[model samples]
Target: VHHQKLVFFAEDVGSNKGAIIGLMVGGVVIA
Candidate 1:
């Protein structure tokens, strides 16, 4: 799950810092 989220965010945000936020958001939703 974590790897998928990281890859998804990385690809979606083009490796920008925004991916961090996106990952956190996904984490929140999962939690």
Candidate 2:
């Protein structure tokens, strides 16, 4: 599903960012 794919992609991108930014943006968006 699109939602699942979005989550997967976000997680991948999130892993590339630092803990702070990743938690603020990536983590917020993904989770």
Candidate 3:
């Protein structure tokens, strides 16, 4: 268990915040 737990991975995807913003913008012009 020597240095086994570490943050060495990178995030290749984004969170729900990006989707939320996209939905917000889409809803604005869909009207």
**lDDT tens string, model 1, 1-31?**
2354443432344444432343342333322
Give the candidate order by descending lDDT.
1, 3, 2
- Candidate 2 global CA lDDT score: 0.35
Residue-wise lDDT of candidate 3 within 1-31, one digit each (tens)?
A: 3544343335565443322231232334422
How good is model 3 by TM-score? Answer: 0.15
Best by TM-score: 3
lDDT of each: 0.37, 0.35, 0.37
The backbone clash count of each candidate, in order, is 0, 0, 0
Model 2: per-residue lDDT, tens digit, 1-31?
2333332343445354533331233334442
Q: Could you tell me which 10 consecutive residues in candidate 3 have the lowest summed lDDT?
A: 18-27
Q: Rank the candidates by TM-score, best first.
A: 3, 1, 2
Assess candidate 1 and give its TM-score to the true structure.
0.12
